[PDB]
């Protein structure tokens, strides 16, 4: 289970006939889904697993960072804007971007300062991830460990193989939910919890089909 | 490959005479080989098998789609009372008052709920798209693209000389329909009318009702 | 008790008061001469005694009962759900086409053309088979659960279930025929 041919596939019983031969079941999250054939070269397939996991980890920090200012504005905490896709505009406000609501907090004023900080900061860390450096040199670029496993959970590879599967499946949900969040922000214009609440008001009437006539062309 | 004129080294190619030598993996073996792989996307002979079985499924859906987008607008011009005869407005028929009438006829299908349509479709497509992958009632172990048997009841694939000829006709009808269904997409986004309306508007005045009428249409500011 | 039955058959009983499925002998008479250019024309002689359809009769009960089981089960529930008598269908469907209260778009003239193509061609394909056990019991799509892998030729019984229900469904529709015009 989860490795070898005992793994469950992406079509269930329908994928028993045809999975790609190179998707043997020696990597986490392998359900044998390469119907486009984009990874029959194993060097490219080694590159794509890095792309999938880094997209998965940024989507997990994304889907939590998009869900937390809305769930805390529902409690009653005053925010400049709860929704994530209007959450960059607070640095152009009057008082600037306060973190929750206070003034002893961050209190961002200049967008050129906070971006040029990020560019040199993520310029170092992402280059360290591609090469190696002050937190590891010869480590695995997929899963380094050591200083990136402080709590001692990257041990006993029978339960560390399962944590690899728990890593990517939580991520593949989160990537599908950021592209979730991306589309439902464009099509509706309201927040994802704001889309969650009015789907709970009337589920039959308020769904995705209520906005199906929106992008129609008419000149 | 036989001496079938569409196969092998002396086959017609996508720049005619200006094409030179085709790529080394396009040996004239599989149908519709005009030697057009300039991006090199199918240099891997395993991805090239996936792209072949992804082109033809796109081709067979777009051949149904291009016939399926002309036909309600062609009959709609001839007085058949569709709710929306135009294809890209044909989804919104479920949202009007009387529902969705096949052929504009109220005592035909009369769909009222779009969630019943999608719930039926996911169950029925998911059963048969999986049958295309493996097994199934109409054929268990067959070819992935050309299964035949129950999907060739007229026997039009018996002669493998004829069958290799008709596969070229299938892919050229398919690539024409994919290229035209992409035309349906773009010239509905740009113009906003049906493709048979765009045809009859072009035929009424080809000098002004070409695509350069809408060239300044997406101009910024 | 009859002797020409009771074996390899669902209804292994000699019910016959008259023996309709009795294999009878036959004798062939010659053709009488009718040539005028002969002086005398004789009445033909006995030529050939012939030793001699239970397979044909088994098929024909099965077809009638299965149409009856579509008829008896179809007349009780169309009387229940719709609320119209089974004899009245046709008088109310010529006026307005319906199924379970849902209006249908078909003229009554089209129903003749629909039924003689669809039901007719399926009846043209049933007699396109030349094996009397396959004519009675075909395979293929009509056994989707694959019960032909089982056996009923021994004492184990896995077939005599439609044919008893075929019998009284013919009778209960015969009871519908004695009830329609009279009562
Ligand atoms: C046998 C039943 C079964 C079926 C039908 C599926 C189906 C699917 N699984 Mg699988 N699974 C099944 C069993 C199982 N799956 C899984 C575990 C997984 C995982 C982890 C994943 C899948 C995924 C998928 C999808 C991959 C193929 C695809 O992308 O289609 C694409 C085509 C469609 C989905 C059809 C199109 C949608 C719709 C019907 C049309 C609507 C049209 C719109 C209105 C168009 C409008 C657009 C406008 C703008 C033009 C597909 C929906 C993957 C996925 O989620 O990707 C989607 C995925 O990550 N499955 C397990 C546990 C091991 C199963 C157990 O039996
Ligand atoms: C020494 C400075 C240094 C700093 C401040 C960071 C900080 C970061 N690293 Mg990085 N790294 C750094 C060096 C290195 N990293 C890595 C390999 C990785 C990986 C594989 C990942 C990170 C990730 C991260 C992010 C979250 C921490 C988990 C954060 C941007 C994670 C991330 O960016 O996911 C969103 C992540 O997956 N780092 C290597 C190679 C061993 C380094 C060499 O010294
Ligand atoms: C010898 C002359 C000859 C020439 C010049 C071509 C040229 C072409 N053939 Mg070939 N063929 C030729 C002979 C033959 N072809 C074929 C059989 C085929 C087939 C089956 C196919 C082709 C296709 C193609 C195209 C392939 C590459 C491409 O897409 O260009 C890319 C570059 C362009 C298309 C230039 C762009 C045109 C225009 C000037 C730009 C317009 C500018 C817009 C205003 C900008 C838009 C604005 C923005 C903002 C939106 C190309 C147009 C393929 C095709 O149709 O794909 C489209 C194709 O499927 N040919 C046969 C029979 C054997 C030939 C016989 O001699
Ligand atoms: C073949 C797949 C497919 C495509 C291309 C469409 C396309 C469309 N549907 Mg639609 N549908 C499709 C399947 C289905 N639809 C519906 C049910 C509906 C309803 C109820 C409605 C629509 C509407 C629309 C139109 C939205 C207007 C618009 O966005 O303008 C911009 C886009 C275009 C002008 C065309 C460009 C097409 C597209 C961007 C490119 C196609 C490639 C896609 C990215 C592939 C996506 C398919 C995936 C899921 C496999 C749009 C043309 C609405 C409508 O009719 O509004 C007037 C509407 O109300 N659809 C069902 C049943 C659940 C489908 C089943 O598969
Ligand atoms: C069980 C019932 C079943 C149903 C309802 C369908 C339905 C469909 N299949 Mg499918 N299939 C089914 C079984 C199977 N299919 C396939 C393999 C395929 C392939 C490769 C393709 C289809 C395609 C199609 C479509 C067109 C059929 C056609 O060409 O008609 C013409 C024949 C007589 C009128 C249609 C949506 C085609 C498609 O989806 O393109 C749009 C297509 O290319 N099927 C296999 C494996 C042998 C099956 C096994 O039973
Ligand atoms: C729920 C998602 C999830 C899961 C199951 C895993 C699982 C794993 N990761 Mg991955 N990872 C993830 C998300 C996840 N990771 C994300 C989002 C990042 C980016 C920050 C990373 C970055 C990362 C690195 C760099 C490394 C791992 C490693 C590991 C392994 C051991 C550590 C472990 O068991 O953590 C299990 C994790 C959990 C049970 C989640 C706990 C819940 C947290 C606290 C949620 C709260 C988030 C917090 C509020 C936001 C702060 C974010 C901040 C840290 C940036 C194991 C395969 C290490 C490894 O394999 O060593 C060889 C390793 O080197 N991961
Ligand atoms: C890619 C394939 C494709 C797709 C997705 C669509 C999608 C669509 N078509 Mg198009 N169409 C296509 C190909 C396609 N078409 C082709 C190839 C043709 C040419 C034959 C047509 C001709 C066509 C017409 C003429 C109409 C549509 C309509 C529709 C819409 C409703 C679908 C529907 O009613 O299905 C359900 C359809 C069926 C199940 C098949 C038809 C069944 C009819 C009702 C006869 C009933 C069968 C039987 C004789 C009676 C049974 C009796 C019963 C009591 C048991 C939808 C937008 C309708 C619309 O309003 O769009 C504008 C419409 O009227 N289509
Ligand atoms: C061979 C047997 C047989 C025959 C001749 C009929 C014939 C008829 N039935 Mg009956 N029916 C049958 C079997 C049969 N049914 C069975 C087995 C069932 C059980 C599922 C039903 C359940 C049934 C109902 C519930 C209704 C009918 C109705 C009808 C009438 C019109 C609908 C129609 O045929 O469209 C068929 C279209 C698609 C299959 C028609 C007189 C309807 C009616 O209006 O009767 C007056 C009606 O409401 N029938
Ligand atoms: C598998 C396969 C197979 C075959 O063969 C082929 C194909 C089909 C191609 C394939 C598929 C694929 C896919 C599905 C893909 C997808 C992806 C995604 C979705 C991603 C995302 C991804 C996503 C992501 C990263 C995301 C991220 C995010 C983030 C960071 C966020 C951030 C933020 C926050 C916090 C909040 C604030 O206020 C703002 C912001 C700034 C907004
Ligand atoms: C070859 C090559 C080579 C080099 O190297 C590179 C490159 C260049 C990349 C390449 C190329 C490619 C291409 C050309 C592509 C294209 C494609 C397409 C267009 C597809 C379509 C495709 C398309 C398709 C599928 C389509 C389909 C469709 C359909 C179904 C439809 C449907 C419908 C109908 C009926 C009606 C209604 O009312 C609506 C709807 C719903 C809408």
Please tell me the distance in Å from C60's CA to the nearest CA on chain B.
30
Distance, in Å, from the CA atom of C183 to the CA atom of C180, rounded to the nearest integer, reads 6
Instruction: Output the residue whose Cα is nearest ligand 10's atom 39.
Output: B87
SS in 3 state form for chain B?
A: CCCCCCCCCCCCCCCCCCCCCCCCCCCCCCCCCCCCCCCCCCCCCCHHHHHHHHHHHHHHHHHHHHHHHHHHHHHHHCCCCCCCCCHHHCHHHHCCCCCECHHHCCCCCCECCHHHHHHHHHHHHHHHHHHHHCCCCCCCCCCCCCCCHHHCCCCCCCCHHHHHHHHHHHHHHHHHHHHHHHHHHHHHHHCCCCHHHHHHHHHHCCCCCCHHHHCCCCCCC
Cα A136 to ligand 6 centre (Å): 17
DSSP classification of residue A108: B
**Which approach determined this entry?**
cryo-EM
Phi, psi of C50 (to 5 degrees): -130, 125
Provide the β-strand partners of residue C46.
Answer: C29
Contacts of A209 in chain B (CB under 8 A): 95, 114-115
Residues in C lying within 8 Å of B, measured between beta carbons: 97, 103-105
Nearest Cα residue to B38 out of B65, B61, B10, B15 = B15
Rounded (5°) CA angle B31-B36-B41: 100
Domain of residue A48: give its range. Answer: 9-212
SS3 at position A136: strand
Q: Which atom of ligand 2 is nearest to the CA of A122?
A: 30
Touching B: A residues 35-74, CB under 8 Å = 35-38, 40-41
**Region label for A148, one of left (φ > 0), alpha (ψ between -120 and 50) or beta (otherwise):** alpha
Q: Which residue has the tokens 């249409």?
A: B217
SS3 at position A217: coil
Asked if residue B105 is part of any domain, the answer here is yes
Q: Is A75 part of the contact surface with chain B (CB cutoff 8 Å)?
A: no
Domain total of chain A? 1
Asked if residue A58 is part of any domain, the answer here is yes
B34 in Cβ contact with B12 (< 8 Å): yes
Domain of residue B82: give its range. Answer: 13-215
Distance, in Å, from the CA atom of B30 to the CA atom of C43, rounded to the nearest integer, reads 77
Rounded (5°) CA angle C17-C22-C23: 170
| Closest ligand, as measured to the CA of B152 | 5
**In whole angstroms, how far apart are CA A156 and each of A139, B5, B46?**
18, 62, 37
Cα A218 to ligand 4 centre (Å): 15
Asked if residue B199 is part of any domain, the answer here is yes
Distance, in Å, from the CA atom of B32 to the CA atom of B51, rounded to the nearest integer, reads 13
Domain total of chain B? 1
Distance, in Å, from the CA atom of A128 to the CA atom of A124, rounded to the nearest integer, reads 6
Distance, in Å, from the CA atom of C85 to the CA atom of C73, rounded to the nearest integer, reads 14
Q: Which residue has the tokens 């790529």?
A: B23
Instruction: Output the residue whose Cα is nearest ligand 3's atom 24.
Output: B14
Contacts of A216 in chain B (CB under 8 A): 88-89, 92
- Contacts of B184 by beta carbon, 8 Å cutoff, 6+ apart: B65, B66, B69, B87, B88, B195
Q: Spell out a b/e string for A178-193, using b for 16 or more CB atoms within 10 Å of the CB, else e.
A: bebbeebbeebeebbb
Neighbouring C-beta atoms of residue C85, cutoff 10 Å: 13
Neighbouring C-beta atoms of residue B209, cutoff 10 Å: 17
A31 in Cβ contact with A25 (< 8 Å): no
Q: Return the partners of chain C (3 or more C-beta pairs < 8 Å).
A: B
Asked if residue B5 is part of any domain, the answer here is no
Element (H, E) at A40: none
Query: Would you state the structure tokens that stand for residue C162, as one six-digit string?
Result: 């439609």
**In whole angstroms, how far apart are CA A105 and each of A97, A98, A109?**
9, 6, 12
A106 in Cβ contact with A97 (< 8 Å): yes
Q: Is B189 part of the contact surface with chain A (CB cutoff 8 Å)?
A: yes
Distance, in Å, from the CA atom of B68 to the CA atom of B180, rounded to the nearest integer, reads 12
Distance, in Å, from the CA atom of A188 to the CA atom of A194, rounded to the nearest integer, reads 10
Asked if residue A3 is part of any domain, the answer here is no
SS3 at position A60: helix
Touching A: B residues 4-43, CB under 8 Å = none
Query: Would you state the structure tokens that stand for residue A61, as one six-digit string?
Result: 């920090």
Distance, in Å, from the CA atom of B47 to the CA atom of B25, rounded to the nearest integer, reads 12
Asked if residue B6 is part of any domain, the answer here is no
Nearest Cα residue to A178 out of A72, A50, A61 = A61
Distance, in Å, from the CA atom of C13 to the CA atom of C1, rounded to the nearest integer, reads 9
Nearest Cα residue to B191 out of B161, B169, B217 = B217
Q: Which residue has the tokens 């199906």?
A: A212
From B94, B115, B122, the mutation candidate for ligand 1 (largest count of ligand atoms within 8 A of CB) is B122
Asked if residue A98 is part of any domain, the answer here is yes
Which pairs from C123-128 meet CB under 8 Å and 24+ separation?
A: none
Breaks (C-N over 2.5 A) in chain B follow: none
Phi, psi of C26 (to 5 degrees): -140, 150
Phi, psi of B48 (to 5 degrees): -65, -30
CB–CB contacts below 8 A, A to B: 66
Distance, in Å, from the CA atom of A25 to the CA atom of C66, rounded to the nearest integer, reads 53
The shortest CB-CB distance from B51 to any of A22, A37, A217 is to A37
* DSSP secondary structure, chain C, as one string: --SS-SSSSSS-S---SS-TT----EEEEPPPP--TTSS------EEEEE---HHHHHHHHHHHHHHHHHHHHHHHHHHHTT---TTTTTHHHHHS-EETTEE----HHHHHHHHHHHHHHHHHHHTS---HHHHHS--GGG-TT--TTS--SSS--SSTTHHHHHHHHHHHHHHHHHHHS--
Distance, in Å, from the CA atom of A29 to the CA atom of B219, rounded to the nearest integer, reads 45
Beta strands in chain A (DSSP E): none
Please tell me the distance in Å from C112's CA to the nearest CA on chain B.
19
DSSP classification of residue A37: -
B121 in Cβ contact with B218 (< 8 Å): no
Q: What is the CA radius of gyration of chain A?
A: 22
Q: Spell out a b/e string for B161-171, using b for 16 or more CB atoms within 10 Å of the CB, else e.
A: eeebbebbebb
Q: Return the partners of chain A (3 or more C-beta pairs < 8 Å).
A: B
Query: Would you state the structure tokens that stand for residue B73, as one six-digit string?
Result: 């607008």
Asked if residue A125 is part of any domain, the answer here is yes
Cα A166 to ligand 6 centre (Å): 10
Distance, in Å, from the CA atom of B11 to the CA atom of B172, rounded to the nearest integer, reads 14
Asked if residue A2 is part of any domain, the answer here is no
């Amino acid at each position: 289970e989860w490795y070898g041919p005992d793994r469950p596939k992406f079509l269930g019983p329908f994928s028993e006939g045809d999975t790609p031969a190179y998707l043997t079941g020696e990597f986490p999250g392998d359900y044998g889904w390469d119907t486009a054939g984009l990874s029959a070269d194993p060097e490219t397939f080694k590159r794509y697993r890095e792309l999938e996991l880094i997209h998965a980890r940024w989507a997990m920090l994304g889907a939590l960072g998009c869900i937390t200012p809305e769930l805390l504005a529902k409690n009653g905490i005053p925010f400049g804007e709860a929704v994530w896709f209007k959450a960059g505009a607070q640095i152009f406000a009057e008082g600037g971007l306060n973190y929750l609501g206070n003034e002893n907090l961050i209190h961002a004023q200049s967008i050129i300062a906070t971006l040029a900080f990020q560019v040199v900061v993520m310029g170092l860390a992402e280059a360290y991830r591609a090469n190696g450096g002050p937190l590891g040199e010869g480590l695995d670029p997929l899963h380094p460990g050591g200083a990136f496993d402080p709590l001692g959970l990257a041990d006993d590879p029978d339960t560390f193989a399962e944590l690899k599967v728990k890593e990517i499946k939580n991520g593949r949900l989160a990537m599908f939910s950021m592209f979730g969040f991306f589309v439902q922000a464009i099509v509706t214009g309201k927040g994802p919890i704001q889309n969650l609440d009015d789907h709970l008001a009337n589920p039959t009437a308020v769904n995705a089909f209520a906005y199906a006539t929106k992008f129609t062309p008419s000149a | 490959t036989p001496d079938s004129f569409w196969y092998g080294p002396e086959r017609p190619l996508f720049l005619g005479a200006f094409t030179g030598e085709p790529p080394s993996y396009l040996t004239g073996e599989f149908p519709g080989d005009y030697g057009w792989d300039t991006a090199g996307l199918s240099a891997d002979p395993e991805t090239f098998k996936r792209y072949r079985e992804l082109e033809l499924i796109h081709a067979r859906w777009a051949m149904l789609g291009a016939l399926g987008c002309i036909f309600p607008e062609l009959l709609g011009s001839y007085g058949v009372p569709f709710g929306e005869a135009v294809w890209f407005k044909a989804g919104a028929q479920i949202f009007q008052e009387g529902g969705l009438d096949y052929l504009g006829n109220p005592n035909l299908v009369h769909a009222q709920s779009i969630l019943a349509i999608l719930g039926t479709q996911v169950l029925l497509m998911g059963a048969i798209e999986g049958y295309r992958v493996n097994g199934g009632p109409l054929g268990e172990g067959l070819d992935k693209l050309y299964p035949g048997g129950s999907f060739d009841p007229l026997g039009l694939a018996d002669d493998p000389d004829t069958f290799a000829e008709l596969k070229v006709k299938e892919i050229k009808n398919g690539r024409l329909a994919m290229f035209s269904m992409f035309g349906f997409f773009v010239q509905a986004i740009v113009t906003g009318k049906g493709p048979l309306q765009n045809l009859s508007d072009h035929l009424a005045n080809p000098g002004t009702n070409n695509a350069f009428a809408y060239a300044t249409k997406f101009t910024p500011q | 008790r009859p002797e020409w039955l009771d074996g390899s058959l669902p209804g292994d009983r000699g019910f016959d008061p008259l023996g309709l499925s009795k294999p009878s002998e036959f004798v062939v008479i010659g053709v009488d001469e009718n040539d005028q250019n002969a002086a005398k024309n004789n009445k033909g002689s006995v030529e050939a005694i012939v030793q001699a359809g239970l397979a044909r009769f088994r098929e024909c009960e099965l077809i009638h009962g299965r149409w009856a089981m579509l008829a008896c089960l179809g007349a009780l529930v169309a009387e229940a759900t719709t609320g119209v008598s089974w004899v009245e269908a046709g008088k109310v469907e010529l006026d307005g086409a319906s199924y379970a209260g849902l209006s249908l778009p078909f003229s009554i003239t089209q129903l003749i053309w629909i039924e003689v193509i669809l039901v007719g061609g399926a009846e043209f394909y049933r007699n396109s088979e030349t094996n009397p056990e396959k004519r009675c019991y075909p395979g293929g799509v009509f056994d989707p659960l694959k019960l032909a892998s089982e056996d009923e030729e021994r004492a184990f019984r896995l077939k005599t279930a439609e044919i008893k229900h075929a019998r009284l469904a013919m009778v209960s529709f015969f009871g519908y025929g004695v009830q329609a015009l009279s009562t």
